Structure formats: C-alpha cells, structure tokens
Design a binder for this molecule. Structure first.
Ligand SMILES: *[C@@H]1O[C@H](CO)[C@@H](O[C@@H]2O[C@H](CO)[C@@H](O)[C@H](O)[C@H]2NC(C)=O)[C@H](O)[C@H]1NC(C)=O
Ligand SMILES: *[C@@H]1O[C@H](CO)[C@@H](O[C@@H]2O[C@H](CO)[C@@H](O)[C@H](O)[C@H]2NC(C)=O)[C@H](O)[C@H]1NC(C)=O
Ligand SMILES: CCCCCCCC/C=C/CCCCCCCC(=O)OC[C@H](O)CO
Ligand SMILES: CCCCCCCC/C=C/CCCCCCCC(=O)OC[C@H](O)CO
Ligand SMILES: CCCCCCCC/C=C/CCCCCCCC(=O)OC[C@H](O)CO
Ligand SMILES: CCCCCCCC/C=C\CCCCCCCC(=O)OC[C@H](O)CO
Ligand SMILES: CCCCCCCC/C=C\CCCCCCCC(=O)OC[C@H](O)CO
Ligand SMILES: CCCCCCCC/C=C\CCCCCCCC(=O)OC[C@H](O)CO
Ligand SMILES: CCCCCCCC/C=C\CCCCCCCC(=O)OC[C@H](O)CO
Ligand SMILES: *C/C=C(C)/C=C\C=C(C)\C=C\C1=C(C)CCCC1(C)C
Ligand SMILES: *C/C=C(C)/C=C\C=C(C)\C=C\C1=C(C)CCCC1(C)C
Ligand SMILES: *C(=O)CCCCCCCCCCCCCCC
Ligand SMILES: *[C@@H]1O[C@H](CO)[C@@H](O)[C@H](O)[C@H]1NC(C)=O
Ligand SMILES: *[C@@H]1O[C@H](CO)[C@@H](O)[C@H](O)[C@H]1NC(C)=O
Ligand SMILES: CCCCCCCCCCCC(=O)O
Lengths: 303, 304
C-alpha cells in the first residue's frame, strides 16, 4: 500500500515520513501547496455564483410560462432543481473545505459533499434514460405525454436515491478523494463492515452500464431505422456532454477500485472529481443554445 | 369543466358524448380498457397477500420478545397494526372495486377505502414526527423512555383520526379518484355543503406541512451539532425518505387538482400516484428487517 488508510479515510500519500494527518483534523498542506487549494476554492466559488442564477432562472421561466410543458421542458425543470440541490447542499461544503484545506465539518461535511454530487449526477443520467425512451417513442412510433414525463421525473429521483443514499447508512461510505477536498464512494478500501466491494459493483452495473445500454439501444433504433428534430438534436448533445463530464471520473474510479493501494498521488482523482462538478451548470446552457422556444421565453421574462 | 360532476363524484372524463356513468352505478369501461382495471386488481391482490403476513409477523415477533421495547420497537409495532387496518379495512374494498370496475359497495365502500388509507398514511407521518423528536432528544441530549414512546403511539392515532374522520361526518368527503377504483379527499369540487375548501387547507397545513417542519427541524439540529444509536438514526433517515417517495407524488397531484379544479386531466393522472401510495402498507417492516439487526435476528429465531 502506497497510501495511508485511516478509520474513515484513505490519503493517496505515504506516511513513511510521518507527516500525514487526517483530512478531518488538519489542513492537507503536506500533499499540496496552499495555492493549489486556493485554485479549487476559486473554481467552486465560480460554479456556485454561476450555478445558482442559471438554474434558478431556468426553474422560474419554466413555471411562469404554461406553454413549456413538453417532456423536455419537464426534464430540464427537474435538472434545474437537482442542480440547485447540488449547489446549496454539496458545493457550499466543497467551497468551505477547499478554503480551509480539509473537511472542517468532519464526516458530516464529507457526506453532504458526496451525497449531493452523486444524487445530482445520477438524476442527470436517469433523466437521459427518460429522454432517450421519449425520443425513441416519438420518432420510431413503436404517445409520450405530460403524465409519462412526470412519471419519468419521479423515476429519476427514486433511481438516484437508490445509488446515493446507501452510503449514508452503511452500504459503502463517502470518503475524501484526491487532495481530500471532495468526497466520493469508497473505491479505495475493502472495509468489510460496510460491504464496499458489492456496492461498487452495484453502482457501476445498475447506475452506469444499464442506463448507457438503454440510451444507446434507443439511439441505435433512431439511427438504424423541424420541431421534433430540434429536440432530438438537443438530446444528442446532452448525452455527449454527460460523457465528457463523467467518463474521466468513472474511469479513474474504476481504475482505483481494481488497483487498490497502488501508487497514485492526490492530483490523480482531484482533476476528474472537480471537473465533474460542472454537471451542476452545463445542462441549462445547452438548453438556451439549442431550444428556440425556451430561449425566447427566457428573453421575454428577463426583459 | 373538462370532467363530469355528479352529486357525489367527479369523473375526469367529459360527458359531451353522453357515455359517463356514476362510479357507484356501473363499470367505468368507458374511460379505460378492462385490462387496465385488471392490472389494478392484480396489484392490490399482491399488496394484500404480501401486506398481511409481513405486518402480522412484525406484530407477532415484537409481542413474543420482551427485549424489543425501545421507542423504535413500539413505533414499528404501531405501524404494523395500522398497516393491518389498511389491508383488511381498506384494500379489500380496493380489490373488490378493481375487479368489477366500479364501487359496487357504493359510497360506503368509498368511505372504507378512503378512510383506512388516509388513517394509515397519517399514522405513519405522525409516527415519523415522534421518531424525529426521539432522535433529537437522544442524540442532541437537550430521557425518552417507554412511557414517552407509548404516549407517542396514542398521539399518532389521535392526530391521524383528526385527519381521516371528519370526511366521514360532514367536513369534506371521500370521493372516487382516477379510474374511480380508489377514493380520496374531495380536491375536485367546491361542494359548499361539506365546506370542502377549508378542509383541504387544514389537511395540507396541519397534516402535511407542520409534521414536515418538525421532522426537518429535528434533523437539522442533528446535522449541525453509540453504534446502537447510529443504527436507529440511520433507519429513521431511510423511513423519512421512503415516506416522501411514497406520498409526495400523491400530495403534489392532489394539490395541483385543488388549485386547478375542472382543468383538463384524465383518469390516469391520479390513478398512478394513488395506487403507488398504497405501498405504504408494506414498506416499513421491509426497512425494519433490512436495517435493524436485533429485530431481524429475533424474527429469524421466531421463524426457525
Ligand atoms: C503518520 O505517522 C505518524 C508517525 O508515526 C503518526 O503520528 C503518531 O501517532 C501516534 C498514534 O496516535 C502517536 O502516539 C505519536 O505521537 C505520533 N507521532 C507524531 C510525530 O506525531 C501519524 O498518526 C500517522 N498519520 C496517520 C494519518 O496515520
Ligand atoms: C351523461 O349524459 C347522458 C346523456 O345526456 C346522461 O344520460 C341521460 O340521463 C338523463 C337523466 O338521468 C336521462 O333522463 C336520460 O334518459 C339519459 N340518456 C341516455 C341516453 O342515457 C347521463 O346521465 C350523463 N352522465 C352523468 C354522470 O351525468
Ligand atoms: C464520448 C466522448 C468522451 C470524452 C471523454 C474521454 C475521456 C478519456 C479518458 C478517460 C479516463 C480513463 C482513466 C484511466 C486511468 C488509468 C490511469 C493509469 O493507468 O495510471 C497509472 C498511474 O499510476 C496513475 O497515477
Ligand atoms: C412499484 C410500483 C409501480 C407503480 C404501480 C402503480 C399501480 C399499478 C398500475 C396499473 C396500471 C393501470 C393503468 C395503466 C395505463 C396504461 C396506459 C397508459 O398509461 O396510457 C396513458 C395514455 O396514453 C395517456 O397519456
Ligand atoms: C425526496 C424524494 C422525492 C421523490 C419523489 C418526487 C416526485 C415528483 C413528482 C411530482 C408530482 C407533482 C404533480 C404536478 C402536477 C402538474 C400537472 C400539469 O401541469 O399537468 C396537468 C395535466 O392535466 C396532466 O395531464
Ligand atoms: C424533496 C423532493 C424534491 C422533488 C423535486 C422535483 C420536482 C421537479 C418536478 C416537479 C413537478 C413540476 C410540475 C410543473 C410545475 O411545477 O408546475 C405545474 C403547473 O404549471 C403549476 O401551475
Ligand atoms: C430509495 C432509497 C433506498 C435506500 C436503501 C438503502 C438500504 C441500505 C441498507 C444498509 C444496511 C446496513 C446494515
Ligand atoms: C383501535 C385499536 C388501536 C390499537 C393501537 C395500538 C397499538 C399497539 C400498542 C401496544 C403497546 C404495548 C404492547 C405490549 C405487548 O404487546 O406486550 C407487552 C407484554
Ligand atoms: C422501482 C420503480 C420506481 C418508479 C416509481 C415511480 C413513481 C411514480 C408515481 C406516480 C407519478 O408520479 O405519476 C404522476 C402522474 O401525474 C400520474 O401518473
Ligand atoms: C465532486 C464530487 C463528486 C464527483 C462525488 C461523487 C460522484 C459520484 C459517486 C459519481 C458517480 C457516477 C455518476 C453520477 C454518473 C456516471 C457514473 C458514476 C457511477 C461514476
Ligand atoms: C389509495 C387511497 C388513497 C391514497 C386515499 C387517501 C389518501 C390521502 C387523503 C392522503 C393524504 C396525505 C397523506 C396520508 C400524507 C401525505 C400528505 C397527504 C395530506 C396528501
Ligand atoms: C433583457 O432585457 C436582456 C438581458 C441580457 C443579459 C445578458 C448578460 C450576459 C453577460 C455575460 C455573462 C457571462 C457569465 C459567464 C462567465 C464565464
Ligand atoms: C505500490 O506501488 C508499487 C510501485 O508501483 C507497486 O509495485 C505496488 O504493487 C503498489 N502496492 C500495491 C498494494 O498495489
Ligand atoms: C378545460 O381545458 C381547457 C384546455 O386546457 C381549458 O382552456 C379550460 O380552462 C379547462 N376548464 C377548466 C374549468 O379549467
Ligand atoms: C478543456 C477540456 C479539458 C478536459 C479535462 C479532463 C479532466 C480529466 C482528466 C483526467 C486526468 C487524471 O487522470 O488526473
């Protein structure tokens, strides 16, 4: 083992020189210089200051205009709400933690940070499953209305909770990653008390592989068989954007899980874990660029 | 209006073609196919056949093991009893109604179905209030013993009855919903003779918002402020999440209807949330078995 395991942490830094301290107890300046922590904090402050207004405006515009009741409108409303939970529930702790160089709030802070990021990301992935099914139904006509869209929304919360909630209550756990200023699922230790290995397999199979199978089956039907075209084009970009956002994180996580205790440093997981937090802001940006009706309503409300 | 109001019903289907019939008089096949009603009957049959044994077993194990006398144990015992009232008092009517496609038993059957589902759901909500307060006292130490647990049990019945009973006796009313095979509070019509509007505000304020405020206050105190206690605290968190999954869709659709009476919605709109919510009779003992090691071990001992 090239790192330092504690009761509730795994620091990717050897304690041969005795300098490692718990990320719930002291600033982690032995593994990165203070200016690097400041860069994480500046980045998180930007995400909060952009993420709050752009997601609140999306929610507000949608509620104000009764014309905006297609399945796409409902799903983007759901994403805006989930993004606001990410921003206020999790990113406020990421910011405070990055400012101080460690989880001042202790494991409770780590739980907040990990839970709301996992919940928000999985709401997005299962939302794409709903949109992929909706596009397949509408285009391939094997009708998907408001009732199905709302049932789709409720479905995304249930699936996301089934992924994000168990590590709060004893199946796996949230644990600091990288420079120790964000938390994720424990890919790092066997920790039999929380049955870590089975949760990670469950997460990658049920909450990553199975959704992508559905999405690409639906896409394969679309391909290998103006208003609707605009929606289909937007969903294509939402799926591409999702993979850009989360595949680096998913790949590094899976590497760690299959290479536990190997020689990797703090920057290895820091970059993908923080890049993935752009998930709280990018979907409304795509929405504005690629949906004429929503863009016009937004300009109408804002002006 | 986009539906059809009768003296004691509101069908979410237009009578512009003359086909609408009272859900107390004839099968409702004009608004859904017979196979759709049969799916409701199959679902209700499963809930009864799972609901009776899992709740009876929870009751039996608790009574047969004097070690199971913590506040959590009393509250889960109370939920088991309330679940059994839901299963035999209400769901047997839901099943018979779904088999035939209308309330063969008339308004009396509608009252039974609505009353026992409302009572059961409200016993669970107010039970979560009791548990949230117990966790607050225990973890934040600002002592909660057997006396307080039993007092909490009696309190949940009083509050739940204060929600479920008035529509039996003239304040609001129970009325069929969706495909007309379950009944709920009258969100649909003004019906001033039963003062419908004031009851709905009372129900959403006293019997939804206020409990939730107490629960999240107690939780917030816990967050911004041993192993045995952690296990109980973890289970209560999951009980609250499960309650919200079960009931928020129904509450949201009900509140939408109340604020948009006569708007254009169909029978499927309330059918799915109202029938999904009936899982409330089953899921709490399932959490209990999965998240309390002492109870699960007692159950194995009893069963084997
Ligand atoms: C890294 O190694 C150091 C040195 O062995 C650990 O610090 C010691 O911890 C023991 C047990 O608490 C104390 O009795 C010693 O006084 C500590 N020594 C010093 C110099 O502080 C330290 O705990 C290790 N870090 C981690 C995270 O395990
Ligand atoms: C829906 O409309 C039909 C047609 O108007 C109603 O049926 C009539 O009801 C009146 C009053 O009971 C009778 O006198 C007529 O003989 C009925 N006509 C037919 C063709 O059946 C029906 O009552 C309406 N449904 C509801 C629920 O109001
Ligand atoms: C569809 C558009 C997709 C756009 C996005 C494409 C992302 C490509 C990269 C994925 C990360 C894979 C991570 C694999 C990790 C292997 C690392 C490794 O072997 O490193 C050993 C070393 O010890 C470590 O410090
Ligand atoms: C785990 C619990 C899951 C949920 C269990 C809920 C209760 C059972 C549902 C029965 C279906 C009855 C109605 C089936 C209707 C199918 C057709 C339909 O939805 O049509 C919509 C229409 O096209 C307008 O948009
Ligand atoms: C904590 C975990 C929570 C998990 C569960 C989340 C549930 C989300 C669903 C909400 C339903 C709200 C109903 C809103 C009604 C909108 C109605 C509408 O605009 O459409 C009317 C039309 O008539 C239709 O056919
Ligand atoms: C804690 C759990 C949080 C769940 C939050 C999820 C909600 C997104 C979808 C909710 C349904 C939105 C329906 C549309 C709406 O809000 O309004 C409809 C209508 O226009 C009104 O007049
Ligand atoms: C929908 C939300 C479902 C969340 C379920 C968690 C079960 C976790 C059980 C952990 C048992 C530890 C012993
Ligand atoms: C109308 C009917 C409403 C019934 C409500 C009772 C709940 C059970 C509370 C029982 C608490 C004490 C149980 C003691 C027990 O079962 O055994 C003790 C030896
Ligand atoms: C495991 C299954 C999870 C899906 C749970 C889905 C829960 C959906 C509840 C019903 C709902 O939200 O439906 C709203 C719509 O207005 C009327 O169908
Ligand atoms: C900054 C904090 C983060 C990234 C914390 C947790 C994130 C996860 C556990 C992400 C899981 C995944 C998601 C949301 C979607 C793609 C696959 C996944 C299972 C790696
Ligand atoms: C299947 C039959 C049902 C769902 C009948 C009635 C249910 C209610 C009137 C439920 C009311 C509420 C409960 C129990 C808890 C959440 C809030 C609420 C007031 C909508
Ligand atoms: C309504 O009357 C007109 C409102 C026009 C608002 C346009 C303001 C855009 C200003 C630039 C914002 C950039 C933020 C992102 C930086 C990375
Ligand atoms: C630690 O790193 C060394 C060097 O790469 C490697 O040989 C060793 O297997 C690693 N330890 C573990 C447990 O993987
Ligand atoms: C019936 O539906 C139409 C179409 O949505 C709407 O214009 C009308 O206001 C509705 N009626 C009522 C009473 O809401
Ligand atoms: C402008 C786009 C930049 C793309 C950055 C991708 C970030 C994740 C890269 C993973 C590196 C690592 O394994 O540490």
């Amino acid at each position: 083992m090239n790192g330092t395991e504690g009761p509730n942490f795994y620091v990717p830094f050897s304690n041969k020189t005795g300098v490692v301290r718990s990320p719930f107890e002291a600033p982690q300046y032995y593994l990165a210089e203070p200016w690097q922590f400041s860069m994480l904090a500046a980045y998180m402050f930007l995400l909060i200051m952009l993420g709050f207004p752009i997601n609140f405006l999306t929610l507000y515009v949608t509620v104000q205009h009764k014309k905006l009741r297609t399945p796409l409108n409902y799903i983007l409303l759901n994403l805006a709400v989930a993004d606001l939970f990410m921003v206020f529930g999790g990113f406020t702790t990421t910011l405070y933690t990055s400012l101080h160089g460690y989880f001042v709030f202790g494991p409770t802070g780590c739980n907040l940070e990990g839970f709301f990021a996992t919940l928000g990301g999985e709401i997005a992935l299962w939302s794409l499953v709903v949109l992929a099914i909706e596009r397949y139904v509408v285009v391939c006509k094997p009708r998907f209305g408001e009732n199905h869209a709302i049932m789709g929304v409720a479905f995304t919360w249930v699936m996301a909770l089934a992924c994000a909630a168990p590590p709060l209550v004893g199946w796996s756990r949230y644990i600091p990653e990288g420079m120790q200023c964000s938390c994720g699922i424990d890919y790092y230790t066997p920790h039999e008390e929380t049955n870590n290995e089975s949760f990670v397999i469950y997460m990658f199979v049920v909450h990553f592989i199975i959704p992508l199978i559905v999405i690409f089956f639906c896409y394969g039907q679309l391909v290998f068989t103006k208003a609707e075209k605009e929606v289909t084009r937007m969903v294509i970009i939402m799926v591409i954007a999702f993979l850009i956002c989360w595949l680096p994180y998913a790949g590094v996580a899976f590497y760690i899980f299959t290479h536990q205790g190997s020689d990797f440093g703090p920057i290895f997981m820091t970059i993908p874990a923080f890049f993935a937090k752009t998930s709280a802001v990018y979907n409304p940006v795509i929405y504005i660029m690629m949906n004429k009706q929503f863009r016009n309503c937004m300009v109408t409300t804002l002006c």
